Protein backbone atom coordinates (compact mmCIF):
# COMPACT_ATOMS: atom_id res chain seq x y z
CA UNK A 1 0.00 0.00 0.00
CA UNK A 2 2.98 2.36 0.15
CA UNK A 3 3.09 3.95 -3.34
CA UNK A 4 6.74 4.89 -2.80
CA UNK A 5 8.22 1.45 -2.07
CA UNK A 6 10.96 0.61 -4.57
CA UNK A 7 13.05 -2.53 -4.89
CA UNK A 8 12.81 -5.92 -3.19
CA UNK A 9 12.66 -6.49 0.55
CA UNK A 10 16.08 -5.50 1.94
CA UNK A 11 18.58 -7.53 3.91
CA UNK A 12 21.65 -6.52 5.89
CA UNK A 13 23.74 -7.95 3.05
CA UNK A 14 21.80 -6.02 0.42
CA UNK A 15 22.29 -2.64 2.14
CA UNK A 16 25.99 -3.41 2.77
CA UNK A 17 26.73 -4.33 -0.86
CA UNK A 18 28.63 -1.90 -3.05
CA UNK A 19 25.43 -1.30 -5.03
CA UNK A 20 21.69 -1.79 -4.69
CA UNK A 21 19.25 -3.44 -7.10
CA UNK A 22 18.77 -0.57 -9.58
CA UNK A 23 21.16 0.14 -12.42
CA UNK A 24 22.31 3.73 -12.72
CA UNK A 25 22.69 6.35 -15.46
CA UNK A 26 24.21 9.80 -15.20
CA UNK A 27 23.65 13.31 -16.50
CA UNK A 28 26.49 15.79 -16.13
CA UNK A 29 25.39 19.37 -15.37
CA UNK A 30 27.98 22.12 -15.88
CA UNK A 31 25.94 24.67 -13.90
CA UNK A 32 22.74 24.07 -11.93
CA UNK A 33 22.52 27.74 -10.86
CA UNK A 34 24.49 30.93 -11.44
CA UNK A 35 27.34 31.18 -8.95
CA UNK A 36 26.80 27.65 -7.58
CA UNK A 37 28.71 25.47 -10.07
CA UNK A 38 27.71 22.11 -11.43
CA UNK A 39 27.39 18.46 -10.52
CA UNK A 40 26.36 15.03 -11.70
CA UNK A 41 22.85 13.57 -11.53
CA UNK A 42 22.73 9.83 -10.93
CA UNK A 43 19.39 8.16 -11.48
CA UNK A 44 17.90 4.65 -11.50
CA UNK A 45 17.30 3.24 -14.95
CA UNK A 46 14.39 0.93 -14.13
CA UNK A 47 11.02 2.72 -14.33
CA UNK A 48 8.57 -0.13 -13.70
CA UNK A 49 7.79 0.74 -10.08
CA UNK A 50 7.27 4.48 -10.52
CA UNK A 51 9.11 7.72 -9.86
CA UNK A 52 11.75 8.33 -7.21
CA UNK A 53 12.61 10.88 -4.57
CA UNK A 54 15.80 12.89 -4.91
CA UNK A 55 18.71 13.95 -2.69
CA UNK A 56 21.23 16.73 -3.29
CA UNK A 57 24.68 16.07 -1.84
CA UNK A 58 26.97 19.02 -1.01
CA UNK A 59 30.70 19.04 -0.21
CA UNK A 60 32.27 21.44 2.27
CA UNK A 61 35.73 22.06 0.85
CA UNK A 62 37.26 23.27 -2.38
CA UNK A 63 39.66 20.32 -2.56
CA UNK A 64 39.58 16.95 -4.28
CA UNK A 65 39.68 15.30 -0.83
CA UNK A 66 36.22 16.80 -0.19
CA UNK A 67 34.56 14.99 -3.08
CA UNK A 68 31.05 13.61 -2.54
CA UNK A 69 30.98 11.79 -5.88
CA UNK A 70 30.72 8.22 -4.54
CA UNK A 71 27.27 8.81 -3.01
CA UNK A 72 25.88 9.22 -6.52
CA UNK A 73 25.91 5.64 -7.74
CA UNK A 74 25.84 4.09 -4.26
CA UNK A 75 22.58 5.77 -3.26
CA UNK A 76 20.98 6.00 -6.72
CA UNK A 77 21.40 2.22 -7.11
CA UNK A 78 18.93 1.85 -4.23
CA UNK A 79 16.24 3.87 -6.01
CA UNK A 80 16.96 7.59 -5.68
CA UNK A 81 17.88 10.49 -7.92
CA UNK A 82 21.17 11.77 -6.48
CA UNK A 83 22.72 15.12 -7.43
CA UNK A 84 26.36 15.22 -6.34
CA UNK A 85 27.58 18.81 -6.15
CA UNK A 86 31.10 19.50 -7.47
CA UNK A 87 33.86 20.78 -5.19
CA UNK A 88 35.07 23.42 -7.68
CA UNK A 89 32.93 26.32 -6.47
CA UNK A 90 34.26 27.81 -3.25
CA UNK A 91 31.66 28.67 -0.60
CA UNK A 92 32.67 29.94 2.83
CA UNK A 93 29.46 29.81 4.90
CA UNK A 94 26.95 27.06 5.77
CA UNK A 95 24.06 29.29 4.67
CA UNK A 96 25.55 29.41 1.18
CA UNK A 97 25.73 25.60 1.19
CA UNK A 98 22.08 25.51 2.22
CA UNK A 99 21.17 27.70 -0.73
CA UNK A 100 23.40 25.62 -3.02
CA UNK A 101 21.60 22.43 -1.98
CA UNK A 102 18.20 23.98 -2.66
CA UNK A 103 19.39 25.37 -6.00
CA UNK A 104 20.49 21.87 -7.01
CA UNK A 105 17.09 20.45 -6.02
CA UNK A 106 15.25 23.24 -7.85
CA UNK A 107 17.27 22.41 -10.97
CA UNK A 108 16.07 18.80 -10.72
CA UNK A 109 12.44 19.93 -10.47
CA UNK A 110 12.42 22.77 -12.99
CA UNK A 111 15.23 22.34 -15.53
CA UNK A 112 16.66 18.80 -15.56
CA UNK A 113 16.77 16.57 -18.64
CA UNK A 114 13.56 14.71 -19.48
CA UNK A 115 15.14 11.35 -18.61
CA UNK A 116 15.63 12.70 -15.07
CA UNK A 117 12.40 14.68 -14.85
CA UNK A 118 10.20 11.76 -15.89
CA UNK A 119 11.74 9.66 -13.08
CA UNK A 120 11.38 12.36 -10.40
CA UNK A 121 8.71 12.84 -7.78
CA UNK A 122 9.24 16.57 -7.12
CA UNK A 123 7.33 16.29 -3.82
CA UNK A 124 9.97 14.05 -2.18
CA UNK A 125 13.31 15.85 -1.86
CA UNK A 126 16.19 15.52 0.58
CA UNK A 127 19.57 17.04 1.44
CA UNK A 128 22.91 15.66 2.58
CA UNK A 129 26.24 17.38 2.99
CA UNK A 130 29.76 17.18 4.36
CA UNK A 131 31.38 19.56 6.84
CA UNK A 132 30.15 23.09 6.10
CA UNK A 133 27.91 21.31 3.59
CA UNK A 134 26.53 19.43 6.58
CA UNK A 135 25.89 22.74 8.27
CA UNK A 136 24.22 23.56 4.97
CA UNK A 137 22.00 20.48 5.24
CA UNK A 138 20.76 21.81 8.59
CA UNK A 139 20.24 25.30 7.10
CA UNK A 140 18.36 23.89 4.11
CA UNK A 141 15.80 22.19 6.36
CA UNK A 142 14.91 25.50 8.01
CA UNK A 143 14.86 27.27 4.63
CA UNK A 144 12.70 24.51 3.11
CA UNK A 145 10.68 22.65 5.77
CA UNK A 146 9.00 20.54 3.07
CA UNK A 147 12.18 18.49 2.61
CA UNK A 148 11.74 14.84 3.57
CA UNK A 149 15.17 14.02 5.04
CA UNK A 150 18.48 15.61 5.94
CA UNK A 151 21.84 13.93 6.54
CA UNK A 152 24.58 16.22 7.94
CA UNK A 153 27.88 14.34 7.61
CA UNK A 154 30.62 15.40 10.06
CA UNK A 155 28.81 18.75 10.09
CA UNK A 156 30.46 22.06 10.89
CA UNK A 157 28.44 25.10 11.96
CA UNK A 158 29.02 27.99 14.35
CA UNK A 159 25.32 28.09 15.30
CA UNK A 160 24.82 25.30 17.82
CA UNK A 161 21.02 24.92 18.11
CA UNK A 162 18.65 23.54 15.47
CA UNK A 163 15.27 23.88 17.14
CA UNK A 164 13.45 24.91 13.96
CA UNK A 165 14.24 21.70 12.03
CA UNK A 166 11.08 19.72 11.25
CA UNK A 167 12.75 17.42 8.70
CA UNK A 168 13.94 13.94 9.84
CA UNK A 169 17.66 14.41 10.44
CA UNK A 170 20.44 11.83 10.71
CA UNK A 171 23.80 13.26 11.84
CA UNK A 172 26.94 11.19 11.30
CA UNK A 173 29.93 12.13 13.44
CA UNK A 174 33.53 10.95 13.30
CA UNK A 175 35.00 9.99 16.69
CA UNK A 176 38.49 11.44 16.14
CA UNK A 177 37.39 14.50 14.13
CA UNK A 178 39.38 17.58 15.18
CA UNK A 179 38.03 19.87 12.43
CA UNK A 180 34.36 19.60 13.39
CA UNK A 181 34.72 17.87 16.77
CA UNK A 182 31.62 15.91 17.67
CA UNK A 183 31.67 17.43 21.16
CA UNK A 184 31.14 20.96 19.83
CA UNK A 185 29.40 20.38 16.48
CA UNK A 186 27.58 17.09 15.77
CA UNK A 187 26.39 16.27 19.31
CA UNK A 188 25.14 19.77 20.24
CA UNK A 189 23.31 19.90 16.90
CA UNK A 190 21.67 16.52 17.53
CA UNK A 191 20.65 17.31 21.10
CA UNK A 192 19.08 20.62 20.04
CA UNK A 193 16.90 19.14 17.30
CA UNK A 194 13.29 18.99 18.55
CA UNK A 195 12.74 16.03 20.85
CA UNK A 196 9.69 14.98 18.79
CA UNK A 197 11.66 14.93 15.54
CA UNK A 198 12.56 11.56 14.00
CA UNK A 199 16.31 11.84 14.36
CA UNK A 200 19.48 9.88 14.95
CA UNK A 201 23.17 10.38 15.66
CA UNK A 202 25.77 7.82 14.57
CA UNK A 203 29.42 8.16 15.61
CA UNK A 204 32.02 6.25 13.58
CA UNK A 205 34.79 4.62 15.62
CA UNK A 206 38.27 5.87 14.79
CA UNK A 207 37.08 8.05 11.92
CA UNK A 208 38.42 11.48 11.00
CA UNK A 209 36.78 14.43 9.26
CA UNK A 210 37.26 13.10 5.73
CA UNK A 211 35.77 9.66 6.39
CA UNK A 212 32.58 10.64 4.48
CA UNK A 213 34.52 11.36 1.28
CA UNK A 214 35.38 7.75 0.39
CA UNK A 215 33.17 4.65 0.08
CA UNK A 216 32.32 3.48 3.59
CA UNK A 217 29.95 0.56 4.17
CA UNK A 218 28.64 1.81 7.51
CA UNK A 219 27.87 5.30 6.21
CA UNK A 220 26.23 3.92 3.07
CA UNK A 221 24.02 1.32 4.73
CA UNK A 222 22.52 3.82 7.18
CA UNK A 223 22.31 6.68 4.67
CA UNK A 224 20.36 4.33 2.39
CA UNK A 225 18.16 3.21 5.28
CA UNK A 226 17.45 6.79 6.41
CA UNK A 227 16.56 7.95 2.90
CA UNK A 228 14.33 4.90 2.39
CA UNK A 229 12.63 5.45 5.75
CA UNK A 230 11.88 9.14 5.21
CA UNK A 231 12.04 9.99 1.49
CA UNK A 232 9.96 6.89 0.70
CA UNK A 233 8.36 6.32 4.13
CA UNK A 234 9.52 2.75 3.52
CA UNK A 235 9.11 1.00 6.85
CA UNK A 236 10.85 -2.10 5.49
CA UNK A 237 14.02 -0.17 6.42
CA UNK A 238 12.96 0.52 10.02
CA UNK A 239 14.50 -2.82 11.01
CA UNK A 240 17.98 -1.37 10.39
CA UNK A 241 17.37 1.89 12.27
CA UNK A 242 15.34 0.79 15.33
CA UNK A 243 16.51 -0.48 17.74
CA UNK A 244 19.75 1.47 17.44
CA UNK A 245 22.38 -0.19 15.20
CA UNK A 246 25.22 -1.97 17.00
CA UNK A 247 27.77 -2.35 14.17
CA UNK A 248 31.39 -2.63 15.31
CA UNK A 249 32.17 0.49 13.24
CA UNK A 250 29.73 2.46 15.42
CA UNK A 251 30.97 3.89 18.72
CA UNK A 252 27.78 5.73 19.70
CA UNK A 253 24.21 5.82 18.45
CA UNK A 254 21.36 8.01 19.66
CA UNK A 255 17.86 8.11 18.26
CA UNK A 256 14.22 8.93 18.84
CA UNK A 257 13.28 5.33 18.02
CA UNK A 258 10.56 4.22 17.53
CA UNK A 259 9.88 6.65 14.66
Strand segments (E) across the chain: 24-33, 37-44, 52-58, 81-85, 120-130, 149-153, 169-174, 199-204, 250-255
- Give the DSSP per-residue string, 68-127: -TTHHHHHHTTT-EEEEEPS-S---SHHHHHHHHHHHHHHHHHTS-HHHHTTEEEEEEEE
The question of whether 177 is a catalytic residue gets the answer: yes
Bridge partners (DSSP) of residue 23 are none
Residues 6+ apart with CB under 8 A from 44: 6, 22, 23, 24, 52, 76, 77, 79, 80, 81, 119
Q: What is the resolution of this structure in A?
A: 1.2
Please answer whether residues 83 and 54 qualify as being in contact, where contact means their C-beta atoms are separated by less than 8 angstroms.
yes
Backbone angles phi, psi at 93, to 5 degrees: -140, 145
* Active site annotation includes 185: no
Q: Which of 86, 177, 232, 234 is catalytic?
A: 177
Experimental method: X-ray
Alpha-carbon gap, residue 52 to 116, rounded angstroms: 10
**CA angle 14–66–160, rounded 5-degree value:** 90
Total tally of structural domains belonging to the chain:
1
How many whole angstroms separate alpha carbon 223 and alpha carbon 151? 8
Q: Which of 69, 131, 137, 225 is catalytic?
A: 131
Rounded Cα–Cα distance for residues 193 and 160 (Å): 10
Q: Report the sign of the C-alpha dihedral through residues 191, 195, 196, 202, in that order.
A: positive
For 103, other C-beta atoms within 10 Å of its C-beta total 18
131: annotated active-site residue: yes
* Annotated catalytic residue, options 69, 121, 209, 232: 209
Dihedral-angle region of residue 216 (phi above 0 means left; psi in -120 to 50 means alpha; beta otherwise): beta
* Residue ranges making up the domain that contains 45: 1-259
Angle at 214 between CA 23 and CA 219, to 5 degrees: 75
Amino acid sequence: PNPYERGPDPTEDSIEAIRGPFSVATERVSSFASGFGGGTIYYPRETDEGTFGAVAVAPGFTASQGSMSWYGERVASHGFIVFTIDTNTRLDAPGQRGRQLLAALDYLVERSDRKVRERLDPNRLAVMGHSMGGGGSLEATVMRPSLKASIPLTPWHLDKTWGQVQVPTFIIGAELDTIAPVSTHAKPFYESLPSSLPKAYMELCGATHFAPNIPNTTIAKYVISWLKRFVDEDTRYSQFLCPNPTDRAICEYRSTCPY
